[PDB]
Amino acid sequence: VAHPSLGRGDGFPFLWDNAASTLDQLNGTDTTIILNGFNYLDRLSMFKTVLEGTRKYFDSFAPNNTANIYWGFTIYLNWILATGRSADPTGHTTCGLAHGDPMCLAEESWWNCIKYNPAAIAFFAAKKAGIFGDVTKTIVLAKPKEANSPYCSSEEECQAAYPDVMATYLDYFEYLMSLEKTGESIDMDKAQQLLWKAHVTSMENSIAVCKPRLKNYNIIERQLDRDYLISLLYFAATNFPTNFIESIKFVADMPHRQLRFGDIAPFIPDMDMKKNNLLVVLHGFYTVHSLSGGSSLTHWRNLMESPVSREMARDMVNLILAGTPVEVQVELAKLGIPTPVDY
Numbered sequence: 001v002a003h004p005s006l007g008r009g010d011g012f013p014f015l016w017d018n019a020a021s022t023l024d025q026l027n028g029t030d031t032t033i034i035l036n037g038f039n040y041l042d043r044l045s046m047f048k049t050v051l052e053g054t055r056k057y058f059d060s061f062a063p064n065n066t067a068n069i070y071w072g073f074t075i076y077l078n079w080i081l082a083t084g085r086s087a088d089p090t091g092h093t094t095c096g097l098a099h100g101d102p103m104c105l106a107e108e109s110w111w112n113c114i115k116y117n118p119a120a121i122a123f124f125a126a127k128k129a130g131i132f133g134d135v136t137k138t139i140v141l142a143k144p145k146e147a148n149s150p151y152c153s154s155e156e157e158c159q160a161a162y163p164d165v166m167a168t169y170l171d172y173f174e175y176l177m178s179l180e181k182t183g184e185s186i187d188m189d190k191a192q193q194l195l196w197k198a199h200v201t202s203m204e205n206s207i208a209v210c211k212p213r214l215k216n217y218n219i220i221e222r223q224l225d226r227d228y229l230i231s232l233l234y235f236a237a238t239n240f241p242t243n244f245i246e247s248i249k250f251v252a253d254m255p256h257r258q259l260r261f262g263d264i265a266p267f268i269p270d271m272d273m274k275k276n277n278l279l280v281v282l283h284g285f286y287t288v289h290s291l292s293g294g295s296s297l298t299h300w301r302n303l304m305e306s307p308v309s310r311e312m313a314r315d316m317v318n319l320i321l322a323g324t325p326v327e328v329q330v331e332l333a334k335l336g337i338p339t340p341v342d343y
Contacts, residue, residue, distance in 0.1 A: 001082075002014035002081050003082055004083055004251065004254070004256040005079070011244065011248050013074065013075065013078035014081065016044070016048070019044040019048040021049065022049060022132075023049060023137070026045060030137075032137055032140050033140065035140070035141050036141075036142040037116060037151060038105045038142060038151075039103050039104060039105065040077070041103060043105065044074075044077060046122075046123040047070065047077065049126075050126050051065060051070050053126065053131040054068060054131065054176060057176050057186050058186070066245065067244075069192055070195070070242070072243075072247050075244070075247040075251055076247070080112070082256075083257055084258055086105040086109050087105075087109065089108060089109060090108050107144055110216070110217065113210035114203065114210050117202045117206060118199060120141070121152075121158050122198065124139070125166055125169035125170040125172070127155075129170060129174050129176075131173050131176070162202075164201050165198070165201055168197050169202075172191070172195050192241060192242070195242065196237075196239060200236045203229060207229065218261055220260060220263050221258050223286075224255070224282070227286045230282075230286050231282045234289075234300060237310075238304060238310050238313040238317060239304075239310050239314070253275055253277075253278040253321060253323075254275065255279065256275070265279035266279065277320070277323050277325050280325070281328055284328030284329065288340065299337050299338065303337065313335060316331050
């Protein structure tokens with residue numbers, strides 16, 4: 001069974017070796033490639049194939065492709081599986097439960113809802129850019145069952161429903177492809193900024209359509225979900241790295257199980273101090289955001305235009321990841337955010 005932070009045991013995702021490295025290895029026929037977006041292993045392949053296709057850009061920094069910035073959502077896929085957050089929370093199907101199909105990722109899961117596109121649409125953008133080489137096969141995606149679903153099931157449908165999402169992931173992969181023609185080395189800060197801009201665009205394009213799924217969870221776990229999504233917008237503006245090491249550091253500090261009535265951070269007794277602390281912090285970003293009418297995020301983005309501000313903001317993120325109990329509003333003030341007051 002998948003471990004929340006360790007994956008299969010060493011940090012790499014559960015069933016890492018079973019996922020495809022190249023499009024050749026995916027199931028299909030001679031004119032089609034078949035992917036089930038609602039299956040863990042196929043989603044893992046959507047990540048792994050891009051990781052193998054982009055390996056050459058990050059090779060001189062570290063072994064085993066661990067400097068690649070595509071690890072972020074790859075590691076979070078393992079975490080949503082390991083913690084039961086991809087399973088059907090309604091009780092209407094056995095999708096994702098141990099007595100049903102444990103690989104199945106539920107349509108009604110809020111986590112699956114927000115994380116689907118950074119797998120699938122990003123995969124299409126990579127293909128279009130030529131990350132995979134030329135590919136004559138047609139991609140066929142398993143279809144959702146809900147009518148008027150937020151989950152798109154083809155290249156054209158995804159393009160039409162989420163055009164900005166497709167475009168921003170494309171910008172990232174097009175920038176990587178340009179390194180082969182300019183005969184230049186990779187600008188890490190610029191590449192990271194490009195990938196973050198796609199992730200953020202995806203989150204923002206999915207927030208309203210995935211919102212109703214929040215109601216399938218109790219109020220404590222549900223507020224964590226909001227806490228997380230809002231916090232991510234703040235973390236992205238800092239250009240914090242989404243490589244292997246940093247991603248492992250984040251999921252280690254995330255709760256290992258779904259929350260329930262009774263859980264109040266930082267006094268959750270089956271979690272270490274680093275997890276309890278991260279939960280307080282996530283809610284701290286939500287509170288600043290909420291009390292300011294979202295205006296703190298706008299200020300934060302403007303301040304994060306400066307590379308020196310971004311470096312200082314990443315230092316605060318490292319303190320937080322180490323378990324240091326910093327007050328978010330007080331730190332944001334120190335970096336020049338006017339901090340709101342409750343009325």
